Structures are given as C-alpha cells and as structure tokens.
A and B are shown apart, each in its own frame.
Chain A
C-alpha cells in the first residue's frame, strides 16, 4: 500500500507537469497564429492580391425556440444536433453534412464562430461533463481534472486547458471531447434578443441563422 500512495503522488506530479508543458506550447501556438494572420493581411495590402482566411471549422450553435409545434424532420435533426431544452448550446464540427443539417434547423437556431476568449470563459464557467458509466451518464460540473483525466486519458488530451485547445481550433480528438461535455445550458441575454420572429440578415430587428463573428458578443451578454 505505501508504495501505491507514493506512486499515485508521482503520477499526480507527472500529469500536472505534462499538462503545464502542453499548455505553454498551446499558448505559444495561439499568439503565433494570431500574429501571423495580421502579418499576412498586411502583406496582401502591400502587393496586389488578397489573402483569405479559412472557413472557421467549428461553430457554436444556440437554440432559440420552444418544444411545441415543431416539424418532424426539424425535431429529428435537433435530436442529432443535440439541442433539446430551449436555450441549449453545443459546438458542431463544420463539414458539408453538418452544415446541411444546420441549414434544415436554421430558422430555429442562431450560430457563429467562437474566438478563443469566448471558448475559455464558457468552458470554465458553464461547462458540465458526463461522469458515469456508458449511456447512463449523470451531469457533473467540471470542477477538477480527475474526471477528465479518466475519460480522455486514452486520447492524451486530458486537462481542462487541453479541452479548450482541442475545441478552439479543431484538433484531432474532437468527437469524443464534444460528446463528453454535457450540452451547455445557457441563461438568457442581459439586454434581451431583438426578435426570434425573424432572421439576423432580415433588415428588421431579428436574430435567426448565421451571425458569424458576432455570436461571441451575444454569448458574452448571455453567459
């Protein structure tokens, strides 16, 4: 037994050290990407040419609409998407297939691109995670690492910071990490919406569909 307690402490120390070095490497990566984008845009300005940034790869989708009176396909898509209760949020991996499914539920959902600060804040302050045995999960607020060091130990992406890193720019271990989080139960916005009645692009007050960048401002109000 005495060796086992000692050994456990060594494992605990190694994990914290390991996570720290990965964290630092991630932090270095983020700034490098951000700076490079600025430099590239300036380079494009300098010559005659345009740089274009990637399509954003992830999308945070917020549901907008009640349980009642929903078309049957739309209800099915919602179930797959994983937004049930009416203000639920989830990250979705942009592809072709996901985007089409998203298109079907479009008048019922706002969505957009996170930015790093938004992900970090949301994951700490409102992240819940699925703790229990297979398909009987039970909802636990994240709180500390030993929970996620269990499930994502195999995939080597344990550490809550590490979860932020995988999500923010789509890492290889995406499907598990997204699945593993419980759907975000969100609080309403401080200054309210404008109209669940219409699209954001309709020139009226209105909210549904793609909001690209501006989703973060909305998330910040309603966190």
Chain B
C-alpha cells in the first residue's frame, strides 16, 4: 500500500461547448487582454462628432502634397501607355507599305 502511487482521476464529462467569440466570460477566460482592448475600443468609440467634423478639413489639407505627388505617378503611367501606342503605330505604318 505504501509503495502504490497516489490515486489518479478520470477524464471529464462533456458539457455543451461554450462559444469562444461571443460569450464574454469564456472569451476573457481564454484571452486575458481582451477586456482592456474592448474597453479601449469603447473609449475611442464614445467620442462625438464635433472634433471629427473640424479635423476632417485638416486631414484633407495635409494630404494635398501627397495628392499632387500621386497625381504625377499616375500621370506618368498613362503617358507611357500613350507613347507605346504611338511607337506601335509608327511600326505598323512602316510595315503596311
């Protein structure tokens, strides 16, 4: 009896699984940080429209320089395509005669 190793305990009867995304307790139990992240998301969310409404103009205004630069990149892309059409056109025109 003294020699025998201590009693071991049998495997666990199957409950209904509990949802790992929408059951709040279950999710928190799985992931400890989730509560902080949700609360942070709610805290950002709370903030009403006035600040956003003034700010949007500022966001657009500081984008302007980027907007010009981007317009140039796409403008260049188009020009290259047009040039290819002209080069092919001369080639075809030469070929025809």
> B-contacting residues of A (Cβ < 8 Å)?
16, 19-20, 23-24, 27, 42, 45-46, 121, 124-125, 127, 141-145, 159-161
Asked if B96 CB lies within 8 Å of chain A CBs, one says no
| Cross-chain contact A42 with B66 (CB below 8 angstroms) | yes
Residues on B with beta carbons closer than 8 Å to the beta carbon of A125:
19-21
Q: B18's closest neighbor in chain A, by CB?
A: A143
Min C-beta distance of A125 to chain B, whole Å: 5
| Cross-chain contact A124 with B73 (CB below 8 angstroms) | no
> A-contacting residues of B (Cβ < 8 Å)?
17-21, 26-27, 29-33, 37, 66, 69-70, 73
Residues on B with beta carbons closer than 8 Å to the beta carbon of A16:
32
Min C-beta distance of A132 to chain B, whole Å: 9
Residues on A with beta carbons closer than 8 Å to the beta carbon of B18:
143
Pairs A–B under 8 Å by Cβ, sample size 10: A20-B32, A23-B31, A46-B69, A121-B21, A127-B20, A142-B30, A143-B17, A143-B18, A145-B29, A159-B31
Q: A42's closest neighbor in chain B, by CB?
A: B66
| Cross-chain contact A27 with B21 (CB below 8 angstroms) | no
Q: How far, in angstroms, from A127 to B31 measured CA to CA in the complex?
A: 15
| Cross-chain contact A160 with B30 (CB below 8 angstroms) | yes
Q: A20's closest neighbor in chain B, by CB?
A: B32
Given contacts A45-B70, A127-B20, A143-B17, 20 further A-B contacts (CB under 8 A): A16-B32, A19-B32, A23-B31, A23-B33, A24-B33, A46-B69, A121-B21, A124-B27, A125-B19, A125-B21, A141-B17, A142-B20, A143-B20, A143-B26, A144-B29, A144-B30, A145-B30, A159-B31, A161-B30, A161-B33
Residues on A with beta carbons closer than 8 Å to the beta carbon of B66:
42
Residues on B with beta carbons closer than 8 Å to the beta carbon of A19:
32
Residues on B with beta carbons closer than 8 Å to the beta carbon of A159:
31
| Cross-chain contact B21 with A160 (CB below 8 angstroms) | no
| Cross-chain contact B69 with A23 (CB below 8 angstroms) | no
Residues on A with beta carbons closer than 8 Å to the beta carbon of B33:
20, 23-24, 27, 161
Q: How far, in angstroms, from A144 to B12 measured CA to CA in the complex?
A: 14
Q: A47's closest neighbor in chain B, by CB?
A: B69
